[PDB]
Design an enzyme around this catalytic site. Structure first.
Site, PDB file in Angstrom:
ATOM      1  N   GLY A  44       0.811  -1.202   0.000  1.00  0.00           N
ATOM      2  CA  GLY A  44       0.000   0.000   0.000  1.00  0.00           C
ATOM      3  C   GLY A  44       0.849   1.258   0.000  1.00  0.00           C
ATOM      4  O   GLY A  44       0.508   2.246   0.656  1.00  0.00           O
ATOM      5  N   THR A  45       1.959   1.229  -0.741  1.00  0.00           N
ATOM      6  CA  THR A  45       2.894   2.350  -0.733  1.00  0.00           C
ATOM      7  C   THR A  45       2.274   3.589  -1.361  1.00  0.00           C
ATOM      8  O   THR A  45       2.350   4.686  -0.797  1.00  0.00           O
ATOM      9  CB  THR A  45       4.181   1.969  -1.466  1.00  0.00           C
ATOM     10  OG1 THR A  45       4.668   0.720  -0.962  1.00  0.00           O
ATOM     11  CG2 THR A  45       5.236   3.025  -1.255  1.00  0.00           C
ATOM     12  N   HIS A  46       1.674   3.439  -2.546  1.00  0.00           N
ATOM     13  CA  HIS A  46       1.007   4.570  -3.181  1.00  0.00           C
ATOM     14  C   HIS A  46      -0.085   5.132  -2.284  1.00  0.00           C
ATOM     15  O   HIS A  46      -0.244   6.355  -2.171  1.00  0.00           O
ATOM     16  CB  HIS A  46       0.420   4.146  -4.527  1.00  0.00           C
ATOM     17  CG  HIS A  46       1.446   3.700  -5.521  1.00  0.00           C
ATOM     18  ND1 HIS A  46       1.914   2.405  -5.576  1.00  0.00           N
ATOM     19  CD2 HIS A  46       2.088   4.374  -6.504  1.00  0.00           C
ATOM     20  CE1 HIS A  46       2.801   2.301  -6.548  1.00  0.00           C
ATOM     21  NE2 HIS A  46       2.927   3.483  -7.126  1.00  0.00           N
ATOM     22  N   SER A 127      -1.003  -9.477  -3.933  1.00  0.00           N
ATOM     23  CA  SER A 127      -0.910  -8.239  -4.699  1.00  0.00           C
ATOM     24  C   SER A 127       0.299  -8.254  -5.625  1.00  0.00           C
ATOM     25  O   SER A 127       0.206  -7.835  -6.786  1.00  0.00           O
ATOM     26  CB  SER A 127      -0.844  -7.045  -3.748  1.00  0.00           C
ATOM     27  OG  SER A 127      -1.056  -5.828  -4.440  1.00  0.00           O
ATOM     28  N   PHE A 218     -10.473   4.283  -1.825  1.00  0.00           N
ATOM     29  CA  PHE A 218      -9.947   3.512  -2.946  1.00  0.00           C
ATOM     30  C   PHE A 218     -10.556   3.953  -4.272  1.00  0.00           C
ATOM     31  O   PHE A 218      -9.849   4.079  -5.279  1.00  0.00           O
ATOM     32  CB  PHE A 218     -10.205   2.019  -2.717  1.00  0.00           C
ATOM     33  CG  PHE A 218      -9.726   1.142  -3.842  1.00  0.00           C
ATOM     34  CD1 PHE A 218     -10.543   0.874  -4.930  1.00  0.00           C
ATOM     35  CD2 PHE A 218      -8.455   0.590  -3.810  1.00  0.00           C
ATOM     36  CE1 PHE A 218     -10.098   0.081  -5.969  1.00  0.00           C
ATOM     37  CE2 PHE A 218      -8.008  -0.208  -4.844  1.00  0.00           C
ATOM     38  CZ  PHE A 218      -8.830  -0.463  -5.923  1.00  0.00           C
TER      39      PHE A 218
END
Ligand code: CHD
Ligand code: CHD
Ligand code: A3P
Length: 274
Positions: A44-46, A127, A218
């Site tokens: 979930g870096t972005h 992912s 999201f």
């Protein structure tokens, strides 16, 4: 060659070099007032990048709409970014993917703020599988269960998730760094963003906080992003963004094997975050 081996760590073939890695580890100075986002890929870096950048802009999406993640928080190890960050003054907003054994040593003698994002390694595996197969040709794609085996043996980008996560959260209780989980971001959203507001010293009030939440959801973040794939599969990082998708991928046998490998590779790991 699947990877580029630098300091016993597998890296992507393009964008990284040993010399640069070494330089970053041994010579790049992390200045006391710097603040760095450190994650493992597909955690979930972005999302977190956008969280922070929307906190700073107090909800105004204009910045994250007009820019990509590497322009806002340049990755230290990425390409020749270290030249840029060295030739820049003031308080710097940076990002990273390295484990602690490759992070700039100077950081261990400074009050630089670090946010470490962790995710359920099973959802991380899922992912990554989907994203790395996302735009390869059918014959050259990677079957599920061999990707699973490679993940469990550390044959993954930036090395073992277990070593990465253990080494980074072994510093959790330091004042200058805080850990947080993708799951926390997904269900205890407001509390979590208020906590990182506290940590970063960024003051934010009502209305602006409602703005941030809305903008970080999201769906509308996905619409924002689809508005540029030079160095990322831009179409493909927004997959579905839930927690627990691994249960739709792991067979029971694979789940037991994963729990087992987790329990000897990360025996000193409590799952309170998940
Ligand atoms: C090229 C590599 C693997 C892609 C592939 O399998 O082909 C991918 C996986 C993780 C990616 C990185 C992560 O997404 C984190 C950074 C996000 C920024 O938007 C670009 C640089 C950034 C540092 C990315 C560079 C590059 O796109 C990476 C390194
Ligand atoms: C990342 C980039 C740094 C380029 C540079 O000066 O070296 C700079 C150029 C304009 C900057 C922005 C502008 O200064 C306006 C905003 C006000 C504050 O400075 C922080 C957030 C804020 C949204 C900044 C985010 C970031 O620091 C930006 C986007
Ligand atoms: N606003 C957002 N909200 C919730 N989850 C998000 C999100 N943006 C991305 N995610 C998910 O974070 C994962 C990618 O993380 P990274 O930036 O490190 O590549 C993806 O997980 P999934 O593939 O499981 O959907 C992505 O869908």
């Amino acid at each position: 060659d699947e990877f580029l081996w630098i300091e016993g760590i597998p890296f992507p073939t393009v964008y990284y070099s040993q010399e640069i890695i070494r330089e970053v580890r041994d010579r790049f100075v992390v200045r006391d007032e710097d603040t760095i986002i450190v994650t493992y890929p597909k955690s979930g870096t972005h999302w977190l990048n956008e969280i922070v950048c929307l906190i700073l802009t107090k909800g105004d999406p204009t910045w994250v709409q007009s820019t990509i993640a590497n322009e806002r928080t340049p990755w230290i190890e990425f390409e020749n970014n270290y030249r840029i960050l060295n030739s820049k003054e003031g308080p710097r907003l940076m990002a990273s993917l390295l484990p602690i054994q490759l992070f700039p040593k100077s950081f261990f003698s400074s009050k630089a703020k670090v946010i470490y994002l962790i995710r359920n390694p099973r959802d991380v595996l899922v992912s990554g599988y989907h994203y790395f197969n996302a735009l390869k040709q059918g014959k050259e794609q990677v079957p599920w269960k061999i990707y699973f085996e490679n993940f469990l043996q550390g044959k993954s980008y930036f090395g073992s998730w277990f070593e990465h996560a253990c080494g980074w959260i072994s510093l959790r209780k330091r004042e200058n760094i805080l850990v947080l989980s993708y799951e926390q971001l997904k269900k205890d959203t407001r509390n979590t963003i208020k906590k990182i507001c506290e940590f970063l010293g960024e003051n934010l009030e009502s209305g602006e906080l409602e703005l941030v939440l809305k903008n970080i959801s999201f769906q509308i973040m996905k619409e924002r992003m689809i508005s540029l794939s030079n160095i990322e599969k831009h179409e493909f990082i927004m997959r579905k963004g839930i927690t627990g998708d691994w249960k739709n991928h792991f067979t029971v046998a694979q789940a037991e094997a994963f729990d087992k490998a987790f329990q000897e590779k990360a025996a000193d790991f409590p799952q309170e975050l998940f």
